[PDB]
């Protein structure tokens, strides 16, 4: 394996029930490493499953030697679902956001503003 994972900064955040760290990925001849295999490498590195690992913000340095990102390893998947941002859970398939747009919601709200009572639910 020619791709290396190191964790410079690291702290056990007991307040948010996780460990948080900065991840260096050495990949001299490859593209920026996909988040999933960084997650499995971190899972081997910290003896846990890759479903409680959330990596993000990976920037590859000019030249191509290495990529630096941030990573969280939660105590359980339940703490991960409780504390993680909804988009980072959606990247794992654990969350789905509203399929409506801001425009549709705003105009529906302003339309409901024109009716009084139970008829508000009978709008749109």
């Amino acid at each position: 394996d020619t791709v290396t994972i190191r964790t410079r900064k690291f702290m056990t955040n007991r307040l948010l029930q996780r460990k948080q760290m900065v991840i260096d990925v050495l990949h001299p001849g490859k593209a920026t490493v996909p988040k999933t295999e960084i997650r499995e490498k971190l899972a081997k590195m910290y003896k846990t499953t890759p479903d409680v690992i959330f990596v993000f913000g990976f920037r590859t340095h000019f030249g191509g030697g290495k990529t630096t990102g941030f990573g969280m390893i939660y105590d359980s998947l339940d703490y991960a679902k409780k504390n993680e941002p909804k988009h980072r859970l959606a990247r794992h398939g654990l969350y789905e956001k509203k399929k409506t747009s801001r425009k549709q919601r705003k105009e529906r709200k302003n339309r409901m503003k024109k009716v009084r009572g139970t008829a508000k639910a009978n709008v749109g």
Binding site: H61, G63, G64
Partner: protein
């Protein structure tokens, strides 16, 4: 209101007299000797040296035991020594006024790449740096105007991924080898 910063600064100054034969000749000599793209590179290095001289002059008007003179002169001299423009022996603010533009021009990455034998000419040095063939320590540097520090001078190598420094022949060589 925006979360943006508008701190920006012009890095050169245009000469007062546009068509002056002596200045045109001096600038063209610098351009040709150091492989510069245009007159703005000369004017940029001139502006850098001018600001350094202005700071040194303003420090030389303070008392020799002035805390600010001591602190900021020491910092300025340390900065000039760090990039090799000043020698460690001349750690006085009076020696700043004796510095030339060529002193700063030697410390460009292009000049050092040419002078360390990595390139056949200063123009070859510039095109080598612009084509991601050169690295300082482990960082592939791509900017010809990169001012080499004193302790970065011995770490200018030929890039571990360039065809000249570690393999993977280039587009042309691979295509020609495929052809025959």
């Amino acid at each position: 209101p925006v979360a943006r910063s508008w701190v920006c600064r012009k890095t050169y100054v245009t000469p007062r007299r546009p068509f002056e034969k002596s200045r045109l000749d001096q600038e063209l000599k610098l351009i040709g000797e150091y492989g510069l793209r245009n007159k703005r590179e000369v004017w940029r290095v001139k502006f850098t040296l001018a600001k350094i001289r202005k700071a040194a002059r303003e420090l030389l008007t303070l008392d020799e035991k002035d805390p600010r003179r001591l602190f900021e002169g020491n910092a300025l001299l340390r900065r000039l020594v760090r990039i090799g423009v000043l020698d460690e022996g001349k750690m006085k603010l009076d020696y700043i006024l004796g510095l030339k533009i060529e002193d700063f021009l030697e410390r460009r990455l292009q000049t050092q790449v040419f002078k360390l034998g990595l390139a056949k000419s200063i123009h070859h040095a510039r095109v080598l740096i612009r084509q991601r063939h050169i690295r300082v320590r482990k960082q592939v540097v791509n900017i010809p105007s990169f001012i080499v520090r004193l302790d970065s001078q011995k770490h200018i190598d030929f890039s571990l991924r360039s065809p000249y420094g570690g393999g993977r022949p280039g587009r042309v060589k691979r295509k020609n080898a495929k052809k025959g």
